[PDB]
């Protein structure tokens, strides 16, 4: 339990940190205007995992 | 003068976004997070 928490948490930061740099998530904010729940869902999903 | 020159300014905008990406996020979290706590003395004291 102690180590599993250390694993899942580290993975998500590795993903969200690299997800913003790529143009996929970058182009969203030039047109949509905001996240649209991407960060909210990501954080929400992390709890479920 | 016509093609390359404007692109240089265009690169700056796409090259400057990676910093504004996080400032609004961090401010929007703490600002919204702090608003969750009560403000009234009666309600706040009841929490204690």
């Amino acid at each position: 339990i102690e180590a599993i928490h250390e694993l899942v948490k580290n993975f998500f930061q590795r993903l969200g940190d690299r997800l913003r740099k790529v143009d996929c998530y970058h182009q969203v904010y030039r047109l949509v205007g905001n996240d649209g729940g991407i960060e909210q869902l990501l954080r929400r999903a992390e709890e479920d995992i | 003068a016509e093609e390359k020159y404007p692109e240089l300014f265009a690169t700056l905008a796409n090259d400057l976004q990676p910093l504004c990406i996080a400032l609004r996020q961090f401010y929007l979290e703490n600002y919204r997070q702090l608003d969750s706590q009560p403000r009234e003395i009666a309600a706040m004291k009841a929490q204690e």
Binding site: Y29 | P6, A13, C20, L28
Partner: peptide, 21 residues
């Protein structure tokens, strides 16, 4: 101001902050 100046040549604009609620 940044978007206002860059608006003169390109449509690549950043995000505003409003109605945070």
């Amino acid at each position: 101001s940044i978007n206002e100046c860059l608006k003169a040549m390109q449509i690549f604009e950043q995000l505003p902050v409003i109605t945070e609620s």
